[PDB]
Amino acid sequence: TTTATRLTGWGRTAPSVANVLRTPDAEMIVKAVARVAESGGGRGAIARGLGRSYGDNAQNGGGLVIDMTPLNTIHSIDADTKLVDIDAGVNLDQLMKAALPFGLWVPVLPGTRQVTVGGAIACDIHGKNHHSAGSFGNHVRSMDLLTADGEIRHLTPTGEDAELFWATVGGNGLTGIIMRATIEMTPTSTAYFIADGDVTASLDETIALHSDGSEARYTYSSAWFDAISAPPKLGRAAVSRGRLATVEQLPAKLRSEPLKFGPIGELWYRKSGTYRGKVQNLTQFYHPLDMAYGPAGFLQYQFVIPTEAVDEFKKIIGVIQASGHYSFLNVFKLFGPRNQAPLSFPIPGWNICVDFPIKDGLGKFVSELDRRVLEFGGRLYTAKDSRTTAETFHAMYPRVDEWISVRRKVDPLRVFASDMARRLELL
Ligand SMILES: Cc1cc2nc3c(=O)[nH]c(=O)nc-3n(C[C@H](O)[C@H](O)[C@H](O)COP(=O)(O)OP(=O)(O)OC[C@H]3O[C@@H](n4cnc5c(N)ncnc54)[C@H](O)[C@@H]3O)c2cc1C
Numbered sequence: 001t002t003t004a005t006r007l008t009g010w011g012r013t014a015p016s017v018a019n020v021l022r023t024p025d026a027e028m029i030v031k032a033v034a035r036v037a038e039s040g041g042g043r044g045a046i047a048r049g050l051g052r053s054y055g056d057n058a059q060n061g062g063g064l065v066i067d068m069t070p071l072n073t074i075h076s077i078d079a080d081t082k083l084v085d086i087d088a089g090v091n092l093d094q095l096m097k098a099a100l101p102f103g104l105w106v107p108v109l110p111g112t113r114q115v116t117v118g119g120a121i122a123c124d125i126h127g128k129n130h131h132s133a134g135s136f137g138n139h140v141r142s143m144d145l146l147t148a149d150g151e152i153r154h155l156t157p158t159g160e161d162a163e164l165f166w167a168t169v170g171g172n173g174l175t176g177i178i179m180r181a182t183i184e185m186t187p188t189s190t191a192y193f194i195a196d197g198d199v200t201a202s203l204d205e206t207i208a209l210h211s212d213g214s215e216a217r218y219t220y221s222s223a224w225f226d227a228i229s230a231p232p233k234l235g236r237a238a239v240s241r242g243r244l245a246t247v248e249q250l251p252a253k254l255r256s257e258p259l260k261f262g263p264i265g266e267l268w269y270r271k272s273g274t275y276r277g278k279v280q281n282l283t284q285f286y287h288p289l290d291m292a293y294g295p296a297g298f299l300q301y302q303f304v305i306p307t308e309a310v311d312e313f314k315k316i317i318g319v320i321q322a323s324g325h326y327s328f329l330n331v332f333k334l335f336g337p338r339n340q341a342p343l344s345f346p347i348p349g350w351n352i353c354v355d356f357p358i359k360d361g362l363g364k365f366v367s368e369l370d371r372r373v374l375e376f377g378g379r380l381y382t383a384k385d386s387r388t389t390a391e392t393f394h395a396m397y398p399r400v401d402e403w404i405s406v407r408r409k410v411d412p413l414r415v416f417a418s419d420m421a422r423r424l425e426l427l
Pocket residue numbers: 010046047048049050051052053054057058068088089109110111112114115116117118119120122123124125126127171172173174176177178179383
């Protein structure tokens with residue numbers, strides 16, 4: 001049932017034509033993978049979720065791409081064990097809606113709810129609550145992985161095959177196809193947050209606010225970041241922090257249904273940006289994230305700098321604003337401890353996501369950012385990358401050789417392959 005399709009990431013860049021399989025039948029996907037294995041490998045096969053990754057990890061030029069979104073069955077949700085058993089193609093919006101009546105909450109939510117469970121694991125996604133909860137991989141209790149040999153492995157975070165489990169987490173689909181998974185959810189009594197808002201005046205006090213220990217008082221924390229204004233205004237931020245509300249914290253009107261889902265403006269945004277104990281629904285707490293692809297002519301760039309290299313981070317921010325490249329929408333947060341996945345993006349430190357409009361000199365400038373981020377012990381995120389080099393990536397991820405070793409043991413014939421894998425020499 002494979003049909004030739006032109007495929008891009010969310011950034012609408014680096015297009016490549018591939019045969020796309022779209023079937024809700026698990027057995028047809030098993031046979032398709034076996035067909036590629038009989039061909040000796042050839043150009044290979046990669047899975048694809050909802051295509052929300054900006055880069056080229058979910059495309060395979062001249063090869064096979066398997067669309068996983070038809071596998072969207074939620075098998076079971078259990079309130080006692082807090083476990084959900086879902087097909088890899090169900091998305092986080094669907095899962096959120098289904099789990100709420102059980103008093104359960106998706107443990108890690110990204111900027112958009114239009115991502116699959118498969119895409120969430122393969123990119124080891126992070127959210128507003130990383131410092132308290134880690135990334136998506138931390139909450140996977142088991143996953144069924146279709147490997148190159150045609151076998152479906154039941155993988156767990158500990159015990160036998162634990163190394164393959166952690167190579168799959170953040171593995172960008174290069175260990176096989178996640179068909180099914182069990183996620184441990186977070187218990188909640190409401191669908192609401194209690195939020196404290198703060199507005200900083202400078203990069204200095206933005207960093208001070210994140211270093212004074214106040215982060216330990218909130219499970220959820222992220223900020224909108226100024227990367228255009230000259231110092232000391234550079235790095236000023238609207239910080240939104242909070243935790244899941246309990247029932248009695250809700251206004252009476254909401255208590256019946258707790259689990260139901262210019263210069264003058266800046267003056268206001270400074271005043272209305274400071275608040276304490278505000279009840280907010282999911283949409284409001286993530287606002288304005290609510291407002292088939294994203295806009296073309298934009299280059300998404302996300303990197304994290306280790307906590308200790310604070311001066312190094314401050315310098316990169318300065319380089320960005322003095323560059324002639326302007327990014328209006330910037331998300332900033334302090335990451336918590338990393339997990340044991342070799343290719344996992346998040347490490348403890350200063351994370352920022354910037355959005356440059358595609359202009360003359362941009363490509364070579366972000367190459368200079370790569371070098372700076374690399375020098376200072378940081379890394380960029382694969383789910384946003386389509387232009388960095390193998391050399392830079394390998395140096396940014398010192399456990400990459402460890403990961404490649406696992407990949408070669410599970411896929412010797414290179415049955416699983418993508419545009420990213422070839423570009424970053426992970427193939
Ligand atoms: C507006 C926006 C906001 C975002 N905010 C955040 C954020 O806050 N935090 C964050 O971490 N990320 C964020 N992202 C990125 C996004 O969460 C990831 O790129 C995610 O992996 C995309 O999910 P997807 O289902 O679209 O997967 P795709 O983009 O289709 O694929 C991505 C990778 O997952 C693999 N994959 C997909 N399904 C399977 C499967 N069944 N088995 C094996 N491998 C599979 C593919 O091989 C590919 O390598 C954001 C993206 C957008 C567009």
